[PDB]
Design an enzyme around this catalytic site. Structure first.
Site, PDB file in Angstrom:
ATOM      1  N   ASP A  38       0.836  -1.183   0.000  1.00 15.59           N
ATOM      2  CA  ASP A  38       0.000   0.000   0.000  1.00 15.59           C
ATOM      3  C   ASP A  38       0.880   1.245   0.000  1.00 15.59           C
ATOM      4  O   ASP A  38       2.049   1.206   0.393  1.00 15.59           O
ATOM      5  CB  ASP A  38      -0.914  -0.017   1.234  1.00 15.59           C
ATOM      6  N   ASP A  40      -0.413   5.024   0.957  1.00 11.95           N
ATOM      7  CA  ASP A  40      -0.691   6.026   1.980  1.00 11.95           C
ATOM      8  C   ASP A  40      -0.483   5.453   3.380  1.00 11.95           C
ATOM      9  O   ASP A  40      -1.083   4.437   3.740  1.00 11.95           O
ATOM     10  CB  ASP A  40      -2.123   6.541   1.826  1.00 11.95           C
TER      11      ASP A  40
HETATM   12  N1  LIG Z   1      -9.552  12.035   2.993  1.00 12.39           N
HETATM   13  C1  LIG Z   1     -10.280  11.419   2.063  1.00 12.39           C
HETATM   14  N2  LIG Z   1     -10.237  10.092   1.943  1.00 12.39           N
HETATM   15  C2  LIG Z   1     -10.987   9.461   1.034  1.00 12.39           C
HETATM   16  C3  LIG Z   1     -11.773  10.126   0.184  1.00 12.39           C
HETATM   17  C4  LIG Z   1     -11.851  11.459   0.264  1.00 12.39           C
HETATM   18  O1  LIG Z   1     -12.568  12.115  -0.488  1.00 12.39           O
HETATM   19  N3  LIG Z   1     -11.094  12.145   1.211  1.00 12.39           N
HETATM   20  N4  LIG Z   1     -12.365   9.222  -0.605  1.00 12.39           N
HETATM   21  C5  LIG Z   1     -13.333   9.410  -1.741  1.00 12.39           C
HETATM   22  C6  LIG Z   1     -12.657   9.631  -2.962  1.00 12.39           C
HETATM   23  C7  LIG Z   1     -12.494   8.594  -3.876  1.00 12.39           C
HETATM   24  C8  LIG Z   1     -11.840   8.802  -5.091  1.00 12.39           C
HETATM   25  C9  LIG Z   1     -11.348  10.069  -5.395  1.00 12.39           C
HETATM   26  F1  LIG Z   1     -10.694  10.290  -6.598  1.00 12.39           F
HETATM   27  C10 LIG Z   1     -11.513  11.113  -4.488  1.00 12.39           C
HETATM   28  F2  LIG Z   1     -11.020  12.385  -4.792  1.00 12.39           F
HETATM   29  C11 LIG Z   1     -12.171  10.896  -3.279  1.00 12.39           C
HETATM   30  C12 LIG Z   1     -11.932   8.015  -0.237  1.00 12.39           C
HETATM   31  N5  LIG Z   1     -11.054   8.173   0.751  1.00 12.39           N
HETATM   32  C13 LIG Z   1     -10.336   7.127   1.515  1.00 12.39           C
HETATM   33  O2  LIG Z   1      -9.760   6.170   0.654  1.00 12.39           O
HETATM   34  C14 LIG Z   1      -9.412   5.087   1.486  1.00 12.39           C
HETATM   35  C15 LIG Z   1      -9.298   3.846   0.616  1.00 12.39           C
HETATM   36  O3  LIG Z   1      -8.163   3.922  -0.296  1.00 12.39           O
HETATM   37  P1  LIG Z   1      -6.660   3.605   0.156  1.00 12.39           P
HETATM   38  O4  LIG Z   1      -6.684   2.107   0.314  1.00 12.39           O
HETATM   39  O5  LIG Z   1      -5.804   3.832  -1.083  1.00 12.39           O
HETATM   40  O6  LIG Z   1      -6.087   4.339   1.337  1.00 12.39           O
HETATM   41  C16 LIG Z   1     -10.653   4.890   2.373  1.00 12.39           C
HETATM   42  O7  LIG Z   1     -10.225   4.609   3.722  1.00 12.39           O
HETATM   43  C17 LIG Z   1     -11.356   6.244   2.263  1.00 12.39           C
HETATM   44  O8  LIG Z   1     -11.686   6.772   3.570  1.00 12.39           O
HETATM   45 MG   LIG Z   2      -2.610   3.022   3.633  1.00 11.70          MG
END
Ligand SMILES: Nc1nc2c(c(=O)[nH]1)[n+](Cc1ccc(F)c(F)c1)cn2[C@@H]1O[C@H](COP(=O)(O)O)[C@@H](O)[C@H]1O
Ligand SMILES: [Mg+2]
EC number: 3.1.3.91
Length: 281
Positions: A38, A40
Site C-alpha cells: 500500500d 498512503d
Molecule cells: N480524505 C479522504 N479520503 C478518502 C476520500 C476522500 O474524499 N477524502 N475518498 C473518496 C474519494 C475517492 C476517489 C477520489 F478520486 C476522491 F477524490 C475521493 C476516499 N477516501 C479514503 O480512501 C481510502 C481507501 O483507499 P486507500 O486504500 O488507497 O487508502 C478509504 O479509507 C477512504 O476513507
Molecule cells: Mg494506507
C-alpha cells in the site's frame, strides 16, 4: 537469525512462524520475490515532527486545482459516505455498493473540473508529502535487484507517481496499481483509465515470472487482501504499520499481520529483511 526483527517497534504474535516464513523467502532469494505494498501511511509517513502527513486524497482535496464549490461537494460526499465505511455494524458486502457510489461520484466530480495533466506535478510540489525514512535504501535495493514493486492505492495514481518521481526514486521496477486519470489530446481530464479501484478491490486482480514469494506491506486491516489474485503464492510475509489508535488496535493487528511495526516512521525493518533475503541466494 534476523537482527532487524529486534528493533523496538517490532511486534510478533508468532516469532517462530515468522522465522519460518523469512527462511523460506531467504531460500527463494530475489528471483522469486515480489513486493506488494500500500502507499498512503505505509510507504508515506503517518506524521513528522508532531504533525500529521497528508494522504494522497488530502493532497488533491487541499490543492489549488480544486475549486471552492467542488471541494464543498467532495466534503459532503465524505460526510455522507465515510460514516458508512467505518460503521462497525455493517459487513463488507453491506458497505461495498456505497463505497462504489462514493468513488464513482468523486471521480465524476473531478471530471467536471478543468484539470490538466501538467497540474498534478504542481499540486505535489506544493504539498507536504513525505516518504518513510529509509525510502532511498528501499527503492534503490528493489531496483538494483530487479524486484517488482506493486504499489496499490484506491486514490489517484498520477499523484502517487509524482510523489515518487519528485523524490527521485521512480525506478522502472515500480508498478503503481491505482486509478489513473484519462486525459484527452488537449490534456484535459475526461475520465479514468482501467477499472475502478475502490477500498474493497485494492488487490492484485487489478494488475510474472515465477514470483511465488511475496512481502506485503500495509497499514490497514483491509490491506491484508492486497496479494489476493496472485496465482500460486508459495510464501507470503505480511508486515503492517500500526500508526494510530495503538492500544485499541494492537491485538487485532498482531493477530492479523505476521509482523507489526508500531509507530515506526522508517522502513528499517523492511530494508533489513530485504537485505537478509537477497544476500542468501
Ligand atoms: N480524505 C479522504 N479520503 C478518502 C476520500 C476522500 O474524499 N477524502 N475518498 C473518496 C474519494 C475517492 C476517489 C477520489 F478520486 C476522491 F477524490 C475521493 C476516499 N477516501 C479514503 O480512501 C481510502 C481507501 O483507499 P486507500 O486504500 O488507497 O487508502 C478509504 O479509507 C477512504 O476513507
Ligand atoms: Mg494506507
Amino acid at each position: 537469525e534476523v537482527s532487524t526483527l529486534m528493533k523496538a517497534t517490532v511486534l510478533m504474535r508468532q516469532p517462530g512462524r515468522v522465522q519460518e516464513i523469512v527462511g523460506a523467502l531467504r531460500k527463494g532469494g530475489g528471483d522469486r520475490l515480489q513486493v506488494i505494498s500500500d502507499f498512503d501511511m505505509t510507504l508515506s509517513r503517518f506524521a513528522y515532527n508532531g504533525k500529521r502527513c497528508p494522504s494522497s486524497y488530502n493532497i488533491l482535496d487541499n490543492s489549488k486545482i480544486i475549486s471552492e464549490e467542488c471541494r464543498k461537494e467532495l466534503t459532503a460526499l465524505l460526510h455522507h459516505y465515510y460514516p458508512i465505511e467505518i460503521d462497525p455494524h455493517r459487513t463488507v458486502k453491506e458497505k461495498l455498493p456505497h463505497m462504489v457510489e462514493w468513488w464513482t461520484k468523486a471521480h465524476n466530480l473531478l471530471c467536471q473540473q478543468k484539470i490538466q495533466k501538467f497540474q498534478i506535478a504542481q499540486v505535489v510540489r506544493e504539498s507536504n508529502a513525505m516518504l518513510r525514512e529509509g525510502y532511498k535504501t528501499f527503492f534503490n535495493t528493489l531496483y538494483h535487484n530487479n524486484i517488482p514493486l506493486f504499489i496499490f492505492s484506491a486514490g489517484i495514481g498520477d499523484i502517487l507517481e509524482e510523489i515518487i518521481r519528485q523524490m527521485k526514486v521512480f525506478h522502472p521496477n515500480i508498478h503503481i496499481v491505482s486509478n489513473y486519470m484519462d486525459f484527452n489530446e488537449d490534456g484535459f481530464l475526461q475520465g479514468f483509465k482501467g477499472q475502478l479501484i475502490h477500498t474493497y478491490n485494492k488487490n492484485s486482480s487489478a494488475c510474472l515470472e515465477g514470483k511465488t514469494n511475496v512481502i506485503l506491506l500495509g497499514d490497514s486491516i483491509g490491506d491484508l487482501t492486497m496479494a489476493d489474485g496472485v496465482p500460486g503464492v508459495q510464501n507470503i510475509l505480511k508486515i503492517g504499520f500500526l500508526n494510530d489508535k495503538v492500544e485499541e488496535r494492537r491485538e487485532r493487528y498482531m493477530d492479523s499481520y505476521d509482523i507489526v511495526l508500531e509507530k515506526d516512521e522508517t522502513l528499517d525493518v523492511v530494508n533489513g529483511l530485504l537485505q537478509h533475503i537477497l544476500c542468501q541466494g
